[PDB]
């Protein structure tokens, strides 16, 4: 039910590299990338939540970060993903986006703040989609076969894969105390909080209101944002409440995989010319092409190459015919016929001649 | 196979338990009512019932 | 649930202009891609070429920008519109009654929730 | 692009009982959105397809697709239930709407 995003929230998490070469904590903290889809989308996890505004509207323009204990909006229209030069996201719901992205070590996705800071988080993410077929394409073409494939469907249709949901731990923050004419105070800020402290009395607990705690400085005491009514992803990365895993739910999570055709281009017609016994091939790769061949006899001797620039290759076709299939096409078959440049029907020596030409195993063991 | 529970009472899966509204009502709700009979088919009903929360002009 | 409320007919001279409006609740609580569809007599048909998500921008496209000019409104809880320099051909019967779209070749896609409709209302172009 | 093609032009059926109609397309991808609508009312939903279903209209209907085609099935029709019937699936890329199927029962 999509409607759950009005129960559980986003959240500040841990950041590897936050631009700058930097570890930090960040509201783009990103969780999983998953990368199952064969046409090479992806599928990212990210500690943002879009499509979704801070009064829990499903504001399609907004999406709404995590600034300090509270969410807050920010432009759906300002959120990116890359890996080298941009991605194009093709869907996006909740904790969940879609990317279609070039080749690259590393993958970083950001936004912009409400404050107009930008932020971001990148991780090393091997990104190279395998090749369907034959041929290693670039893009598709507006003329190919189609070939079977998988991707990760646009409709965010929440059914089948699903994650969990827990109570968030509590939210320390060493700005609710503070020093004063040598008591501690406590600040209070209409959220309850837990408390505790080494001092001279056993004043620890847990309050809705600030408080005074006697003769003690400030780092005697520590405290935190304990009570949290709306629910959260139970990702690494973020402490667990209590060893139980307890005050659960479940999300499920969008864009299903789909088998699904994707189109290939076919390498244009080689140049061919044949001799005796071989045809010869001139080959137009615009992008690297595989080129298979096989007897079609009893040892099939099957052979390939990744060709990746023009280039003519010379094939032996034996009496059991070859086949060769190169990228996308059909296979080509090839027979030999029993052409001579010698005679029968003509004197000795171009008799001898013909033979050898048609049968060089029998006539040199017969003559 | 057979019905889930709200552990108060042998409830089935996903029906109103008094009214609509469920976390809107109170909002840790969750805490009690969807800790682990989502491991049984039929809770997938009360996500549909509870949050898409149904007052009096949400209607059929 | 996106539960809709708009006014009933109304008459505007040629050439006038009229802010049709549409109040949102049945969840909702705030302008959600609110969409239209609008008809007359005859074979078909027509999602309005100012009207999908109605907030990033007013939904003009690669038609309906031309000799006719509107604007679809960010207010709160609501999906006003604005439809300007109308002429007989904008005379319709109107359904600002559509939950989300899904507008595909955008860098986006939506929800498919309950989607029940809400209810008309009309233009009548005229003297 | 691609169209919307319902293949019946019209319908004509009996005041109790049930009928299938039929929407063809060389793709959709997305949610397919079955309508019903009678004279002097605004438009109202049946049900999803060529996605994955969610129904509107009190439970008496059916949808399925497979290749080309997506598909609709109506049942129960005691009551007056004639209307002219739609399939949609909205716009950013040019595609638009079905040209509509009207639907009766016997007189």
């Known amino acids: 039910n999509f409607n759950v995003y009005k129960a559980i929230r986003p959240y500040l998490a841990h950041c590897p590299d936050c631009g700058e070469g930097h570890s930090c904590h960040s509201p783009v903290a990103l969780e999983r990338i998953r990368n199952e889809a064969t046409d090479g989308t992806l599928k990212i996890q990210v500690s943002l939540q879009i499509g979704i505004k801070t009064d829990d509207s499903h504001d399609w323009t907004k999406l709404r970060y995590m600034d300090n204990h509270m969410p807050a909006d920010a432009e759906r229209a300002r959120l990116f993903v890359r890996t080298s030069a941009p991605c194009t996201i093709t869907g996006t719901m909740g904790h969940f986006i879609l990317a279609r992205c070039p080749k690259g070590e590393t993958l970083t996705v950001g936004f912009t703040d409400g404050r107009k800071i930008s932020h971001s988080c990148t991780h090393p993410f091997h990104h190279d989609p395998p090749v369907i077929g034959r041929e290693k394409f670039h893009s598709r073409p507006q003329h190919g076969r189609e070939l079977p494939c998988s991707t990760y469907a646009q409709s965010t249709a929440a059914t089948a894969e699903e994650i969990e949901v827990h109570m968030p731990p509590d939210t320390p923050d060493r700005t609710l105390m503070s020093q004063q004419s040598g008591n501690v105070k406590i600040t209070v800020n209409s959220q309850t909080v837990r408390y505790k402290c080494n001092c001279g009395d056993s004043n620890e607990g847990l309050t809705t209101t600030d408080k005074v705690i006697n003769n003690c400085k400030v780092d005697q005491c520590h405290a935190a944002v304990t009570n949290h009514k709306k629910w959260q992803y139970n990702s690494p990365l973020v402490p667990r409440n209590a060893e139980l895993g307890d005050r659960k739910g479940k999300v499920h999570i969008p864009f299903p995989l789909a088998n699904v055709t994707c189109r290939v281009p076919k390498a244009r017609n080689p140049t061919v010319t044949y001799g005796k016994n071989q045809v010869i091939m001139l080959l137009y790769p615009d992008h690297p092409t595989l080129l298979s061949y096989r007897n079609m006899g009893e040892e099939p001797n099957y052979q390939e190459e990744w060709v990746t620039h023009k280039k003519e290759i010379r094939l032996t076709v034996p009496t059991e015919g070859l086949e060769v299939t190169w990228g996308n096409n059909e296979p080509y078959k090839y027979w030999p016929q029993l052409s001579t440049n010698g005679t029968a029907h003509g004197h000795p020596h171009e008799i001898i001649l013909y033979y050898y030409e048609l049968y060089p195993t029998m006539t040199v063991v017969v003559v | 196979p057979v019905m889930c529970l709200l552990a108060n009472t042998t409830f089935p899966c996903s029906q109103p338990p008094c009214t609509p509204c469920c976390y809107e009502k109170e909002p840790e709700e969750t805490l009690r009512m969807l800790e682990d009979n989502v491991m049984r088919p039929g809770y997938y009903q009360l996500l549909q019932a509870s949050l898409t929360c149904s007052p009096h002009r949400q209607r059929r | 649930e996106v539960q809709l409320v708009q006014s009933g007919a109304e008459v505007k001279k040629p050439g006038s202009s009229v802010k049709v409006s549409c109040k949102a609740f049945?969840?909702?609580?705030?302008?959600?891609?609110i969409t239209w569809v609008r008809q007359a007599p005859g074979q078909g048909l027509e999602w309005m070429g100012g009207?999908?998500?109605?907030?990033?921008?007013?939904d003009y496209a690669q038609k309906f920008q031309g000799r006719v000019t509107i604007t679809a409104d960010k207010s709160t809880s609501t999906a006003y519109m604005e439809l300007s320099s109308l002429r007989s051909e904008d005379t319709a019967v109107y359904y600002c009654?559509?939950?989300?779209?899904?507008?595909?070749?955008?860098?986006?896609?939506?929800?498919?929730?309950?989607?029940?409709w809400g209810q008309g209302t009309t233009v009548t172009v005229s003297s | 692009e691609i169209v919307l093609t319902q293949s019946p032009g019209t319908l004509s059926l009996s005041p109790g009982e049930r009928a299938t109609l039929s929407c063809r397309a060389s793709?959709?991808?997305?949610?397919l959105a079955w309508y019903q609508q009678k004279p002097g009312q605004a438009p109202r939903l049946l049900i999803y397809?060529?996605?994955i279903r969610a129904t509107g209209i009190p439970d008496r209907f059916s949808g399925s697709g497979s290749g080309t085609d997506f598909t609709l099935t109506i049942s129960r029709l005691a009551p007056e239930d004639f209307a002219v019937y739609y399939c949609?699936?909205?716009?950013?890329?040019?595609?638009?709407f079905g040209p509509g199927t009207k639907v009766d029962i016997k007189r």
């Open positions: 009654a559509r939950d989300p779209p899904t507008h595909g070749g955008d860098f986006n896609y939506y929800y498919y929730g309950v989607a029940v």
């Open positions: 049945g969840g909702t609580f705030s302008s959600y891609a």
């Open positions: 009207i999908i998500p109605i907030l990033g921008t007013t």
């Open positions: 793709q959709s991808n997305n949610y």
């Open positions: 397809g060529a996605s």
């Open positions: 949609q699936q909205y716009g950013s890329s040019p595609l638009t």
